[PDB]
Assembly symmetry: D3
Homo-oligomer: 141 residues x 6
């Protein structure tokens, strides 16, 4: 089943939005199969204006997540809201919580291919957990 990479960026962790973000994905019906707190290294930030974006991204921890579900790549992005918080609607994470595109609190993979790459980049295979939600028959026909 489809998987996507969702991150709480360092502004999101600093502003105490980790639980709130996780809650919204859980409530939606998506399944958490990877989760990790980490501080990106400068080198990881270099791979991911330049000195500035690198420095912010390696300045503090992010929370990396892998979520599983039908249409979760697109759906996860819908939950996050438009990338640019000026365009984000209330009810979304960015619409509720962000102002500035450079401090937009979170990230979600923008396609299936890019999800596979991002998951592989941040998570070793052994760190992902395959399990079955006891609610699968209530969420999916």
């Amino acid at each position: 089943s489809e998987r996507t990479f969702i991150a709480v960026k360092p502004d999101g962790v600093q502003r105490n939005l980790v639980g709130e973000i996780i809650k919204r994905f859980e409530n939606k019906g998506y399944k958490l199969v990877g989760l990790k707190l980490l501080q990106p290294t400068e080198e990881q930030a270099k791979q991911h204006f330049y000195s500035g974006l690198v420095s912010y991204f390696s300045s503090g921890p992010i929370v990396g997540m892998v979520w599983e579900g039908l249409g979760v790549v697109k759906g996860g992005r819908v939950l996050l809201g438009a990338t640019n918080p000026a365009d984000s609607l209330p009810g979304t994470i960015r619409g509720d919580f962000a102002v500035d595109v450079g401090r937009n609190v979170c990230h979600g993979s923008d396609s299936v291919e890019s999800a596979k790459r991002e998951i592989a980049f941040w998570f070793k295979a052994e760190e992902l957990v395959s399990w079955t939600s006891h609610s699968v028959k209530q969420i999916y026909e």
Copy 2:
């Protein structure tokens, strides 16, 4: 404002503990609860879709308010959860169209039919909200 609509928490909604959450959103909006009942549809009432619909309880509700048929549907969000926006019930809580948590009458006429189908007249309560002048100008 005396328009009425039928809202249901389907069995997946009840199983996933969304009854209170749904009621809350209608109450917050300003709509008035005039009928409420927990029931398990019979196979016959349902008559794959039949089996799921008669497999467990639903919560049936009648809500009253100005434009409540359309408004109730806006609160539920698009019927197909792929199209539902966050902030709506389905946008927040549903993934699959076949397990889309809830239902709202799609028109005034079909609301009248649905209400009559699930509720006996005596089961609906007419009352006046002490907030009516705060919610409606006239």
Copy 3:
């Protein structure tokens, strides 16, 4: 575990839009909803339950909840009967001020729960079903 209790949102609770909030808390706790009904008590029903007039003046929501220790646990969720003594986090602690407008009711014992359930609900109105989360809430 199959224990059951009667919970009511009194008319002030319904008027003040607390029905959903109360149901949510019971659902969140893990208790199972097996009866639910909106109704306006008759004066006669209020007599059995000034207090008469208020109680029969508008609708209440009657509920039956099932779970281990649900009679006591339901009352703990409601908070002390007198809101002056109710702690924040409970329904009355969060939402009520006056004992005469204390928003809700819960059966005070197993025996009185059986009586209250039987009084407000006909047998055919209660639904027996199994939560898909039963093994996540209960070890045995």
Copy 4:
């Protein structure tokens, strides 16, 4: 287009009566906007006449208290209105204040300045300069990107 931009937000009397003051303030705080003015007041008949059916809207608006607020942040005039939702609740989407809480355009719970110029005028009309408080949020670097 400055982060120092300011807008006027009001909880109208219906919003105060229906206990939506805290909820409205929370949404602005959550968004990252900064509260620089706040005041509970009952508009006078004369103040209601200027603000705006010219029998009826006046009477309701001067009938009880409103909460007046000044919020500061990048694009806060437009952003504040997005949080409130469409002016007519029929058009307001869930997730917004009016989409979540209002039904009738005549009882639409709140108000926000519709432009930068009208925000300056509204702020000046409801607040004396000495009532606004300038301070710095300890989260400014988390909300706004430094070059």
Copy 5:
């Protein structure tokens, strides 16, 4: 009819707890009769400084039956270490020196605090449309 003074201290305002605190008082059934974002005046500071020998903050006045004690119950114990979850400080504070809010500790001190922070003309007397639902 009783009234009390509740304040969101500067840490509370900085940490975005103003709405959350107001909400809890509204939800409880108490009535907001004074509200203002404020900075002490030089004259207010002088008199505070003198009185201790016996910003911004948000200042509030709330009205209701038993609101002085009730308001404090909503805030939770003064020292957050002792505050229980469900209260403001139990949910949101760790350190007694950054305990987010304040409520008058008695009826007499409420009168004094209200008078100190609010001019009489800044309080609004009004009737909640829900008064008969909250009070018998």
Copy 6:
């Protein structure tokens, strides 16, 4: 700089309480320095019927930092036995059965050190400073 170990047990993960639990610790002012989703091995559960349930699915392991966080974290979780947990706590709000009590927190500073070391390798913990430290602590 005190630290404690908090876990969402498998029932808690299954019942979608991870975010809710994290939120409460964040709201309180505590600082997240370790976070990981994992499925305990049978061997790991033996050291911690109870073995089978604990190794049956994923838990979320967390390390939190703050003044008095060991005791404070337990106060947020509520009494170990949900029958005794008060509303406003995680177990008071969400749990019924002591065998399915949703979560765990270290019971002392010494046991927190042991539990943190057991579940987290040193390189998995992140040391950082909250931009709100001076708003949460007077001495910071």
